[PDB]
Design a protein around this ligand. Structure first.
Ligand SMILES: [Zn+2]
Lengths: 242, 271
């Protein structure tokens, strides 16, 4: 049940223009302007404009091991006009070049940089519309509907523990969805529904939230996020909240 | 001392009380600076001190260990320029060692660790010229150093606490469908900005019946039923560390809360 939260939110058109408070990050625009790429073969990725900052944009992408993409309007190739919030297109991207300064300054909210906006083809335009139908946006947050096929033979579960200073005693599962993306879930919320092989007799359906990552995974079910157990016998009920 | 008493934690002192103590301490031979323009890194025995410096807004690196500390010092020196930092330590073998390569930036403050949090700050303010202001209740996250603090009227965080902590804790919940969502939505609509420093909370949701309720303020927003806060400067949100707020904080009148947009810690002025 995609429910009332999907009304007026499906797609990427409900993304608000959020002000950038410059005096909190007075050197931000210089980093974005100056940032460079590692010199390897660029990889294609489906990206969505989620933030705009005077001459720059941050893009979300579900591509594995990519946590957001910086778009430099002045350096990126293939741009017909300034990006707009909710724009979806394919970009060639590269990892940003790591600098010694990185340790000494604010957290950098992207891992990759767009090098070119790929021209659109009849096939890619079909993939773009498909993606729009699979996500929903509101209040500045993107969500994606996913299915975890826990009831099928392929292993789609992995435990992840993060001993970071503030999340030492928080344990999670990485879940692999049928569409290939990784999502997180608090371990205690799902542990007692799995067998010893980390499978189960149901599939897990949920709109997952995009936000700051646990490890390299930036989609999350959370403690109380609405999630649904689809049992092989046909029954559907909610996974209890944690 | 292992058997000596504990000092009042800085977290319990109202900022205005702390402002009155510190505003009269400065080194007049140094150029005055706002806290965020002062860059500091603390030796490994001064982590709590560094967190207290963050409280008044100083930019502080907290090393995880001696190796981490030395790596920072090498990197700061390699980068130089605007990124050079004052190195705070105490008289010790560490200080002696630091002088061999960082004499010009290292300050050793005697007895800094046998000394109350407020007295620690007074020592720092006597050495520097810090320009503090009464309105800066919580300029910086003491836990991760971030300046990106989202300021909410207390009722917003009370809403969050009841939905994310209390509802599932007091009786078994198979789902969240029994939470009085409309009651709390209507209370959000009638937060008097005059009671919370003029902060007007803008409430939004996709539809009158939708549970995707968002509270937006000038510094960011809070997606209540997603337990996710998002500072206006950032593209990605953070899970709010709401289970760590004592229940009693929400009985305080006209209290504002700060949610860190980078680590999710919740903070407020001391009682
Ligand atoms: Zn923080």
């Amino acid at each position: 049940i995609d429910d009332e939260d999907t009304y007026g939110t499906r797609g990427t058109s409900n993304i608000p223009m959020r002000p950038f408070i410059k005096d909190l990050a007075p050197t931000m625009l210089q980093l974005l302007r100056q940032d460079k790429t590692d010199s390897e073969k660029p990889q294609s990725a489906l990206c969505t404009v989620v933030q705009k900052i005077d001459g720059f944009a941050i893009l979300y992408t579900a591509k594995r091991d990519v946590i957001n993409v910086l778009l430099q309007e002045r350096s990126c190739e293939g741009l017909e006009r300034s990006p707009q919030l909710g724009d979806v297109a394919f970009f060639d991207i590269l990892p940003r070049r790591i600098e010694t300064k990185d340790r000494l300054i604010f957290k950098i909210p992207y891992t990759h940089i767009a090098v070119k906006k790929k021209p659109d083809t009849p096939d890619s335009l079909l993939k773009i519309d498909c993606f729009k139908n699979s996500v929903r946006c509101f209040g500045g947050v993107l969500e994606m509907k996913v299915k975890i096929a826990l009831s099928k033979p392929e292993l789609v579960v992995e435990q992840y523990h993060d001993n970071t200073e503030m999340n030492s005693d928080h344990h999670f599962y990485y879940l692999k969805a049928t569409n290939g993306v990784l999502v997180t879930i608090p371990k205690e919320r799902l542990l007692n529904h799995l067998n010893s092989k980390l499978s189960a007799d149901f599939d897990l359906i949920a709109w997952v939230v995009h936000r700051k990552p646990i490890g390299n995974v930036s989609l999350h079910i959370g403690k109380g996020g609405e999630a649904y157990q689809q049992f092989t016998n046909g029954d559907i009920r909610e996974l209890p909240p944690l | 001392g292992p058997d000596s008493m504990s000092y009042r934690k800085l977290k319990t002192i109202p900022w205005l009380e702390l402002y009155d103590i510190l505003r009269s301490h400065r080194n007049p031979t140094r150029s005055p600076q706002r806290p965020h323009d002062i860059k500091v890194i603390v030796d490994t025995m001064l982590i709590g001190f560094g967190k207290n410096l963050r409280r008044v807004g100083i930019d502080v690196i907290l090393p995880k260990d001696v190796s981490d500390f030395r790596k920072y010092l090498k990197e700061i020196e390699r980068v130089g320029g605007e990124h050079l930092r004052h190195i705070i330590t105490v008289p010790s073998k560490s200080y002696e060692a630091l002088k061999m390569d960082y004499d010009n930036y290292t300050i050793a403050i005697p007895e800094l660790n046998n000394m109350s949090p407020v007295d620690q700050l007074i020592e720092f303010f006597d050495l520097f010229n810090v320009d503090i202001r009464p309105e800066d209740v919580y300029p910086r996250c003491t836990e991760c150093n971030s300046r990106l603090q989202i300021k909410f009227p207390g009722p917003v965080l009370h809403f969050l606490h009841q939905y994310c902590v209390i509802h599932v804790q007091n009786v078994y919940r198979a789902d969240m469908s029994e939470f009085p969502l409309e009651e709390w939505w209507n209370r959000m609509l009638h937060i008097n900005p005059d009671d919370y420093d003029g902060v007007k909370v803008e409430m939004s949701r996709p539809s009158p019946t939708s549970k995707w309720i968002v509270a937006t303020v000038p510094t960011g927003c809070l997606h209540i039923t997603r337990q996710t806060a998002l500072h206006t400067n950032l593209p990605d949100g953070i899970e709010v560390r709401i289970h760590k707020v004592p229940d009693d904080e929400f009985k305080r009148r006209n209290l504002s809360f700060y949610v860190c947009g980078e680590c999710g810690t919740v903070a407020c002025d001391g009682r």
